[PDB]
Amino acid sequence: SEITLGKYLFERLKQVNVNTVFGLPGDFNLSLLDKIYEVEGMRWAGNANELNAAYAADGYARIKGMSCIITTFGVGELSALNGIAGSYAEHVGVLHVVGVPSISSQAKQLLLHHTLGNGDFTVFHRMSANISETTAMITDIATAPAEIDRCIRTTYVTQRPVYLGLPANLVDLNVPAKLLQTPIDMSLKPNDAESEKEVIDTILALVKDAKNPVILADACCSRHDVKAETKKLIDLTQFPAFVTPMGKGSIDEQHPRYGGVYVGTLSKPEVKEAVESADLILSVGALLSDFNTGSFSYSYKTKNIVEFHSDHMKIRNATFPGVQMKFVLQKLLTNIADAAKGYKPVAVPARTPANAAVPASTPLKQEWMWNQLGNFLQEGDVVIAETGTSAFGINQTTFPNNTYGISQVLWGSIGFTTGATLGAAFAAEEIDPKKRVILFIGDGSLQLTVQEISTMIRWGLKPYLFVLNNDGYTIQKLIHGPKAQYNEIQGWDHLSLLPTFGAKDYETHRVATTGEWDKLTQDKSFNDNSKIRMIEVMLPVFDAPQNLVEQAKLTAATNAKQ
C-alpha cells in the first residue's frame, strides 16, 4: 500500500512509456537512482556526460513521446542546459529531474560543494526556469506526488522541458501506492466552443472555394503530434502535400500526392512553383526559422493561408488565440471530404530522377550521395542529420514511408546528434528491435559529443554512424573564412573510435567513391541492424548541397548588416 517517493517517480515514468532514464549520478541523486532497479522494465543509460545525456533524452522523447534526464545539483544540471534549451526551442518534452541537497542543508545555507559559495540554493533553478515550460522545487512530502504528476503532465502535453528539483531527504519517504492507480490525465482542455466552430466553418468554406489547395507539414505537425490527422487530411482531400526541412518525415514521401520539400526560394523549382501557385495553403505546424525557410523567403501568391498550431489558429490575417489544432483537425476530418468534392487533382512535382550510372571510381560528392541515399533507406528507419552539410543535404533524400527524421533546424547545436542517436536507438529498440537508426554526422560535429558512442556500445545498440569527413567545418567555410584556422579541426582516426571505446561487436567501413558507396549500402548483410557500425565517408572540403551554398551567403549578409 506504500511506495517511496523515488520509486513513485519511476512508476509514473513507466506509465508514460518512459523506460530508459538519462543522466549521471552524483552527490544528491544516488538514493533516487537506486529506485530505477526496483521498477521492472526501467533502465539507467549511464551517459558519458550530462550534455550528451540531455541530447539523448531529446532524441528519446522525439521517438517515444517524452523522456527524463536526472542530474545532480549545480555541476550536473548546468552541464545539461544547452540540451534542455534545444528541447525548449524545438518543442521536445524532456523532464529534467535534479537531485538537490536536503531542505535543512539549504536553510542552513551551508558552503556545500557544487554551490557558488554564497549560500544561494535557488540560483540554478532560476537559471533553468528560463528554458522550461514550468518548474517545481519539492519541499513537502504531502504535495510531492501531485507535483511530480503535474511536471510529467506538463512535459507530455506541452512538449517542452520541465524542471523538477528533488531533495535527497524526500526520495526515501513512503507515500500511498494507491495514488499510482489513478493515471495522469494527458487529455487537452477542450477549445472555446464558439471560436472552434468559427475556425472550422471558415476552413471548410475556403476548402469548398479552392481549385488548387496544398498541404504543407512543418515542425509542429510532428512535435505536437498531429501526424495521423495530417495523413488522414491528405487522404480525404487528395491535395498535394509538401514538407519543410524541420518537418521532414512527418508525412509519407511515397504517398502518390507527396510533392517534395518546400524551402522558399531554395526549393527545387517545380516544388517552389507548385506550392506558391496554390490558391489555399493548409499549413500544419509552421515554424518559420531562417534555415527552415531560406532566410524567410516564402513567396505564397495566395492570401488564403490557414495556419494550424498547437495553441492557436490563424486564417489569413485573423488570429484565434487558444484554439488548439488537435481538436480542429479531428473535427475537420468529419466533413472535409465533402468540402473538397469539387476538386480536380493537380499533378504533383515528380521525384528527383535517379543518379545516372557513372564509373565505379567516381569520387563521392554530396549531391550524388543525398540523391543515392534513398536506395538504402527502408520503412521504419529513424534518420538523423547533423547541422552542417548533413542537415542541408538530407532535404534532397527521398524517404520510404514511415521514416522518422530528426534534424535540429532551429536550435542547430552541433554535436546534438551523437546524443540524439543514442536516445533514438533506446526508444527504437523498445518499439521494435528491427527498426534501424541511421546517423549522418559531420567530422567537426562528432568531436563535441564523441564519447556518447561509448554508451551505445555499453547497451549493445546498433545504429549506423555515417561520419562525413570533409576535413573541417565545411558549412562555416561557406559562410565565412574558407581557409581560416578556426574552421579547421584536428584530424581523427574515426574508424578506431569504436574499439577505443571498447566495442567488441561492430563493423567499420570507408567509402570514397560511388562504387564503394553502392557496394556497401546494397550488401544484404550491411542492411541488417545486426551490430553497431561506423562508415567514414570521404568528401571534398568545399563540396556542399547547393541550397547550403546560398543559405550561407544569406546568413553571412544578415550578420554583417549595419
Ligand X SMILES: Cc1ncc(C[n+]2csc(CCOP(=O)(O)OP(=O)(O)O)c2C)c(N)n1
Residues 66-105 that bind its own copies (CB under 8 A): 74-75, 78-79, 81-82, 85-86, 88-89, 101-102, 104-105
Q: Sign of dihedral through CA atoms 312, 319, 263, 449? A: negative
Q: How far is the CB of 440 from Mg ion (least distance, A)?
A: 11
E strands, 75-184, in order? 94-100, 134-137, 162-167, 174-176
Nearest to 64 by CA among 427, 367, 377: 427
- State the Cα–Cα distance between residues 390 and 245, nearest whole angstrom: 12
Nearest to 247 by CA among 237, 257, 258: 258
Number of residues this chain uses to bind ligand X (CB under 6 A): 27
- The most distant pair of C-alpha atoms in the chain lies apart, rounded to whole Å, by 74
Q: Residue 290, Cβ neighbours under 10 Å: how many?
A: 16
Nearest to 68 by CA among 26, 104, 97: 97
Binding at 445: pick from Mg ion, its own copies, ligand X, none (beta carbon under 5-8 Å per type): ligand X
Q: How far is the CB of 262 from ligand X (least distance, A)?
A: 22
Q: Which of residues 33-62 bind ligand X (CB under 6 A)?
A: 50
The single-letter code of the amino acid at 371 is N
From 11, 17, 19, 127, residue interacting with its own copies (rule: CB under 8 A): 127
Nearer Cβ to ligand X (72/310): 72
Q: Which of residues 372-411 bind ligand X (CB under 6 A)?
A: 386-390
Helix (H, G, I), strand (E, B) or coil at 34: helix
Q: Where do we find the cell 496554390?
A: 278
What the block records as the C-alpha cell of 79 is: 552541464
Q: Which of residues 459-478 bind its own copies (CB under 8 A)?
A: 473, 476
Nearer Cβ to ligand X (309/477): 477
Give the 3-state secondary structure percentages of the chain, helix then strand then coil, rounded to 5. 40, 20, 40
Looking from the CA of 115 toward its CB, the CA atoms found within 13 Å total 16
Q: Which stretch binds its own copies (CB under 8 A): 36-44, 188-196, 343-351, 364-372?
A: 36-44
From 297, 335, 476, 527, residue interacting with ligand X (rule: CB under 6 A): 476
- State the Cα–Cα distance between residues 326 and 329, nearest whole angstrom: 5
Binding at 423: pick from Mg ion, ligand X, its own copies, none (beta carbon under 5-8 Å per type): none
159: left (phi over 0), alpha (psi -120 to 50) or beta: left
Q: How far is the CB of 463 from ligand X (least distance, A)?
A: 17
E strands, 470-547, in order? 506-511, 532-538
According to the binding rule CB under 8 A, does residue 500 interact with its own copies?
yes
Nearer Cβ to its own copies (346/549): 549
Q: Which of residues 464-493 bind Mg ion (CB under 5 A)?
A: 470, 474
Nearer Cβ to Mg ion (239/440): 440
Q: How far is the CB of 290 from its own copies (least distance, A)?
A: 5
According to the binding rule CB under 6 A, does residue 445 interact with ligand X?
yes
According to the binding rule CB under 8 A, does residue 130 interact with its own copies?
yes
According to the binding rule CB under 8 A, does residue 331 interact with its own copies?
no
Q: Where do we find the cell 526560394?
A: 265
Q: How far is the CB of 460 from Mg ion (least distance, A)?
A: 23
From 89, 151, 475, 535, residue interacting with ligand X (rule: CB under 6 A): 475
Q: Which of residues 538-557 bind its own copies (CB under 8 A)?
A: 555-556
Q: Which of residues 404-463 bind Mg ion (CB under 5 A)?
A: 442-444
Interface mask (CB under 8 A) for its own copies, residues 276-295, using x and -?
A: -----------xxxxx----
End-to-end CA distance of the chain: 67
Q: Which stretch binds ligand X (CB under 6 A): 13-21, 197-205, 241-249, 466-474?
A: 466-474
91: DSSP letter: T
Nearer Cβ to its own copies (343/492): 492
Burial of 236 (0-12, 13-18, 19+ CB in 10 A): middle
- The answer to whether 102 and 51 have CB atoms below 8 angstroms apart is no
- The answer to whether 4 and 35 have CB atoms below 8 angstroms apart is yes
Q: How far is the CB of 423 from ligand X (least distance, A)?
A: 17
Q: Which of residues 408-427 bind ligand X (CB under 6 A)?
A: 412-415
Q: Where do we find the cell 557544487?
A: 114
Nearest to 389 by CA among 425, 344, 441, 436: 441
From 60, 262, 308, 501, residue interacting with its own copies (rule: CB under 8 A): 501
Nearer Cβ to Mg ion (246/391): 391
For 305, phi and psi rounded to 5 degrees?
-115, 120
From 244, 371, 395, 449, residue interacting with its own copies (rule: CB under 8 A): 449
From 144, 313, 323, 468, residue interacting with ligand X (rule: CB under 6 A): 468
According to the binding rule CB under 6 A, does residue 262 interact with ligand X?
no
According to the binding rule CB under 8 A, does residue 562 interact with its own copies?
yes
CA 473 vs. chain centroid, Å, equals 22
From 109, 110, 119, 431, residue interacting with its own copies (rule: CB under 8 A): 110
Q: Which of residues 40-69 bind its own copies (CB under 8 A)?
A: 44, 46, 48-51
Interface mask (CB under 8 A) for its own copies, residues 334-363, using x and -?
A: ------------------------------
- State the Cα–Cα distance between residues 371 and 443, nearest whole angstrom: 21
Nearer Cβ to its own copies (136/461): 461
Nearest to 86 by CA among 387, 473, 450, 461: 387
Nearest to 94 by CA among 53, 137, 144: 53
Torsion of CA 290, 294, 295, 299, to 10 degrees: -120
According to the binding rule CB under 8 A, does residue 215 interact with its own copies?
no
Residue in the shown chain whose Cβ atom is closest to Mg ion? 442
- The answer to whether 54 and 87 have CB atoms below 8 angstroms apart is yes
According to the binding rule CB under 8 A, does residue 451 interact with its own copies?
yes
Q: Which of residues 77-116 bind ligand X (CB under 6 A)?
A: 79
Q: Where do we find the cell 510529467?
A: 152
List contacts with Mg ion (CB under 5 A): 442-444, 470, 474
List contacts with ligand X (CB under 6 A): 24-26, 50, 72, 75-76, 79, 386-390, 412-415, 442-445, 468, 470, 473-476
